[PDB]
Design a protein around this ligand. Structure first.
Ligand SMILES: Cc1cc2nc3c(=O)[nH]c(=O)nc-3n(C[C@H](O)[C@H](O)[C@H](O)COP(=O)(O)O)c2cc1C
Ligand SMILES: Cc1cc2nc3c(=O)[nH]c(=O)nc-3n(C[C@H](O)[C@H](O)[C@H](O)COP(=O)(O)O)c2cc1C
Ligand SMILES: Cc1cc2nc3c(=O)[nH]c(=O)nc-3n(C[C@H](O)[C@H](O)[C@H](O)COP(=O)(O)O)c2cc1C
Ligand SMILES: Cc1cc2nc3c(=O)[nH]c(=O)nc-3n(C[C@H](O)[C@H](O)[C@H](O)COP(=O)(O)O)c2cc1C
Ligand SMILES: Cc1cc2nc3c(=O)[nH]c(=O)nc-3n(C[C@H](O)[C@H](O)[C@H](O)COP(=O)(O)O)c2cc1C
Ligand SMILES: Cc1cc2nc3c(=O)[nH]c(=O)nc-3n(C[C@H](O)[C@H](O)[C@H](O)COP(=O)(O)O)c2cc1C
Ligand SMILES: Cc1cc2nc3c(=O)[nH]c(=O)nc-3n(C[C@H](O)[C@H](O)[C@H](O)COP(=O)(O)O)c2cc1C
Ligand SMILES: Cc1cc2nc3c(=O)[nH]c(=O)nc-3n(C[C@H](O)[C@H](O)[C@H](O)COP(=O)(O)O)c2cc1C
Ligand SMILES: Cc1cc2nc3c(=O)[nH]c(=O)nc-3n(C[C@H](O)[C@H](O)[C@H](O)COP(=O)(O)O)c2cc1C
Ligand SMILES: Cc1cc2nc3c(=O)[nH]c(=O)nc-3n(C[C@H](O)[C@H](O)[C@H](O)COP(=O)(O)O)c2cc1C
Lengths: 139, 139, 139, 139, 140, 146, 142, 139, 140, 149
């Protein structure tokens, strides 16, 4: 029953800061009732998100997210049953990680990948999860 | 011969505070002589209980409990020999786990299951045990 | 939700070949619709039985069996989720293990226990399951 | 790069044998160019399918499949990188598993689940995988 | 010459007195050092549980002498095997009495490892026996 | 209760005769089967090596009776522990004698598990004792680990 | 000191069957004296090779190979100590893997990758090694 | 694609402190843009270097390094995918290890090798990695 | 008294000839049985590789005596450790020569475990040494 | 090629503190250039020593040591490749372990063997190693010939 899904996506070219906010707010409104928790990362132009909850709800949320016009080319990175949650304190939270980010954040990206800018297509599922767990500790 | 049994059951629709007090008083009277220790949670309408002791005593106790008119449809979740007890401090303790429960407790439910309401049907034996271990810590 | 339960019980002194056949017919009548499979051994006066199927069904069947006048003092030996069935070929089958059994059967009894009569009380869960597995492959 | 996705779905109530022939024809036409292999099972009313190929390809194929009108409520059971393929010999194969199937097949379904009828919602990723591997071997 | 450990349990004769246990301790503290024996004895009326460590020949000589003692019967070897290192090396022998008058802490410890609050070795496996003995040694 | 194995060695008294060995084995055959004891006794003059398997209470009753026997001394428990299943199918009615008059096959077997072609339990570990005993039971078709 | 090195590279655009022959002949000439064994696959335009031998020899051979004007952009996929050889019967053997290959070979390529064309740059070390073992097996020679 | 390569080299006989500084300057200039991290140890006349980064980049850098006239006889000690970086705080750092090194440093060299002087071409992958990690913490 | 194995390599003197190896074998086959020693010797000019099995004391007596032999020098103990059971128990000693004129099957076995077709014990670890000696024993 | 060799031997009857001092002086002279480290214990009449270094060096040193007229009947206890040294701090350390040793040291002997007197023949290689590691941890100085602990 308890499941996790990690996926990456391509946000549309002309995304603004307000759009990230619109996504965060919607997720923070819908997720609690569905028992969904997780963490969303935006590294222009890419999204990386982890979702935790029961299987039915994880799948409902995921398949509804894919219909969002603000991104395309979704790539499911990992989907499996889990023993326990790691993001249970957040309905959803949003972190931007890019070329202007601090050395501490850049060094985390580098720790799990080939460069200092976050590229989900360049990481396996273990590196994706670990990156997310570590970035969760910074703020 | 040292054993653990975890089960869940459906409490009757009528259960008042006094019924929970009666169960707890009975278990605290009977369990010490029988070398039984453990923990009972009530998440309306369901019970989740763990019992530890010598195999014959755990079985005697469990089969007596199944005859109780205050619940039905008992579902053994796990019954196994164990190396050492984990609930040795309590002949029996009883905890209500519901929507009125504290943030800490609700988050613990969420850690091991799809929602913030405790539903033993939604969890495997490992998640049941870990939940019970962690809530026992809180109490 | 796939589960196995193994228990032992004390059959009443009265028991005749026809009682075993009655039990067999009853289990072969009820088990298929309930998705239950397994194996019953009778070693005067002890029974040893393994039940496999969905959690809800295994429990309904088990708790029904305890109510049977023909045995008493049930002892759950193991109850746990399983990856796959081992006794799937029969809804139920019944074997008598005694001094008139084949040498091959007597040897299997001795393999997993202290005497050449099957006494489940003495046997741990791995010994019970292995005995049942071994005797099922000969029959 | 090399990935496998297993999912289940609900087929529309009015599915004919011609519809399964149709689905099979499209997948046998589309899958080779995209390097997709696997197996589809239909147990009325549900589908169970495994897809193998490079991550980008598996994702393209799956997300196209979910936007198909002949089924709904897709539930991804597992999506992960894999060491090597298991269904490489078929671009796609379609097997119907129901109450009319062979006793061999029925016993197989029962080996991995609570019942003789295939119900993916009741199965974990390992049980799904092994069922699909075993039924493929008998075909 | 190999380093060994033997854990066994036995039944004390009815009406063993605190003095008999003192006599057992005194003899063991006199004999064990010269034979290189270390370990721990626990008495939970009517039962004894003892662990002995030392060289194979000495552990065996000591054990088979102990079985001849009129103060207990029906000895049950729980485990006897070569060991990597001792755990009771600081004591030639110690004796601990565990009953219904022992501390809440001790009683909880007995319960952690077995089916009741009185110690019944015949019910515990070798790993439970050793770890109980290790844990009880630690608090005393 | 629990299934157990015990392996021990001892020193036969100096002047032990074939009739004495026969008497021991006649006793063993009389008692062991009824008591659910399987295993084998080996004699490599002047030493004995035996393996007992069965219920813990029974293995212990049998062993402690053996230690009181005036025909041997200085018994050494080599191993005693719970086991998952038996490795000996029967109580072996015969005595296996292992000595300088043994067959080349048997001597090579002794050598396989120890420093010499004569069986010396004091120089073997529990695994070596167990495997030697299993292998020789197999050679004598008494046998074969189920 | 026994080692394996697996790498991939880009063959030159103007590569001909004759060049494949010269490489194989040079390899068969040099490899025995240096204790090198292994296997070379060519999937236009890519080479995939495994080399086994003493670390010093594997490294001498590898670094000489990278200087060859017949390929560029070498990608070491794995280099590590090994317990025993897996390709000891061949000093060097060459196999072309393409669209004219047997269906059995095509199916083998698919078993370890996304497509029926061999693309080394899309296979992890375990996949490369297992592909090469399997393909050596379906072929023959010593 | 995240990789690590460890190798050893023989520096030319004539190398001066200025040559080492030139190597370091070049590497700190080039490595960042290529996402390369690591550590270089010089134990006259030998080099031992660890490189981390994307497979393509590690390989580009490595093969460029082998073309350098200041060293010869390169020996790849290990090259493999990695879970995460261990260097990463450094584009590149250089440490000289010799007869004038600290007692602590000489004892570390001895801990991993036959002598107080580092002989890179004599240590296995595990010894190389751990030596490098250990000496990184000392400085 | 512990059962032991020791594997070592050495350098034979330059002028060694077939008779020398025959004298080594005959001496080994004479001495080893009474000492309970088993094993196998390979000579790959100029190198010897030998495995010895037996009781710790005897393995050591034999080895330290072998090292005093004028027919070889620079001995390198490759491994020495207690063992669970013997693998060469059927031979007091055997001697095998492995050279550039051995069978291809033997030369390939050499190659399976090392950098070359000539046996060089210095080029192999304890596992490769043991496995080679086991495999070459089986094919003889 | 990093190796460890542990052996025991019987010292000749007459050995004096000066003989032990001579052995240590010799080992501390030779071991450094050979990259050898380790630890020697003397429990009259027996020696127990562990040597670490490159395989060739451990072997050269060992076989030279067996030629020493001050001991006989050497018994190799274990000889095998190692991943890392454990005795790297001293080219050689030497400790007398006997019945005039401290209770702390006697308890260590008992921890790994039948008695409080060190008898290498009564210990398996893991016991020898761990005993040597534990004694290395509590000493100190390069020897206890001048001052104990
Ligand atoms: C990258 C991305 C991630 C999203 N994650 C979530 C999510 O975690 N939970 C959620 O409810 N909506 C998520 N959404 C937003 C939903 O797609 C959609 O806007 C929402 O269902 C609309 O809810 P509303 O109509 O109540 O505002 C995400 C959107 C984007 C593009
Ligand atoms: C869910 C639940 C849990 C119970 N747990 C225990 C228990 O741990 N021990 C016990 O003796 N009785 C337990 N009981 C109560 C028994 O069923 C029964 O009422 C009690 O043992 C009667 O003893 P008394 O008549 O002496 O009061 C439980 C009952 C319920 C319904
Ligand atoms: C030891 C034993 C094992 C039994 N096993 C089963 C069983 O596997 N399935 C079942 O339906 N009934 C089993 N029963 C029989 C039931 O207790 C009961 O007789 C049966 O449900 C009556 O069904 P019927 O009215 O159709 O005959 C068992 C009874 C005994 C004593
Ligand atoms: C249960 C199910 C499984 C399907 N599996 C595949 C598949 O494996 N590959 C594929 O290309 N289409 C698959 N489809 C069919 C596609 O959704 C759809 O028919 C296709 O994109 C159009 O094919 P066409 O070329 O015939 O128009 C599946 C459909 C259903 C409902
Ligand atoms: C349960 C129990 C444990 C004993 N433990 C030891 C022991 O560890 N060491 C010992 O020498 N005697 C032990 N004995 C005592 C011996 O049986 C016996 O009294 C002793 O050999 C007599 O020595 P003494 O005559 O010098 O007093 C134990 C006795 C009992 C009943
Ligand atoms: C070395 C040796 C091994 C023995 N093994 C057994 C045995 O396994 N089982 C047994 O009952 N008696 C065994 N005994 C014999 C007993 O000590 C005792 O003599 C015998 O059980 C008496 O039984 P009886 O009165 O029927 O003759 C053994 C004796 C010796 C010396
Ligand atoms: C992809 C490829 C693989 C090669 N493999 C080997 C090899 O395994 N062994 C070898 O000696 N040369 C190999 N070479 C050839 C060498 O680079 C080089 O041509 C060789 O040293 C020439 O030797 P020769 O002058 O004696 O002919 C390979 C070349 C290519 C491009
Ligand atoms: C032992 C050694 C290690 C080197 N490491 C690196 C390195 O990590 N990164 C790098 O870019 N160049 C490295 N080089 C230097 C390159 O070979 C080359 O000199 C340099 O990249 C030229 O860059 P520049 O022209 O910008 O100065 C190394 C050279 C040597 C001899
Ligand atoms: C490489 C080599 C291996 C040897 N192996 C053995 C051996 O296994 N057993 C043995 O007794 N002597 C062995 N020797 C021979 C002894 O060194 C020595 O010649 C022997 O003690 C002479 O015995 P003899 O005087 O009875 O002939 C070996 C010698 C060499 C050089
Ligand atoms: C038990 C014992 C241990 C020894 N350990 C070493 C050693 O670790 N290193 C060493 O060089 N010599 C060791 N020796 C000393 C050598 O046998 C020999 O006396 C010494 O190497 C001669 O060197 P010197 O002439 O410079 O004094 C040891 C001797 C004994 C008896």
């Amino acid at each position: 029953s308890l499941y996790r899904l990690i996926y990456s996506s391509q946000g549309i070219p002309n995304l603004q800061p307000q759009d990230l906010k619109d996504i965060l707010e919607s997720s923070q409104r819908n997720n609690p009732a569905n028992g969904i928790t997780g963490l969303l990362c935006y590294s222009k132009p890419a999204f990386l998100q982890v979702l935790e909850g029961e299987c039915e709800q994880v799948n409902e949320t995921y398949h509804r997210i894919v219909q969002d016009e603000r991104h395309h080319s979704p790539q499911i990175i990992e989907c499996m049953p889990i023993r326990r949650r790691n993001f249970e304190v957040w309905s959803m939270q949003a972190i931007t990680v890019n070329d202007l980010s601090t050395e501490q954040v850049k060094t985390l990206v580098l720790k799990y990948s080939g460069f200092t800018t976050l590229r989900p297509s360049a990481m396996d599922p273990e590196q994706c999860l670990n990156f997310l767990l570590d970035i969760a500790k910074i703020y």
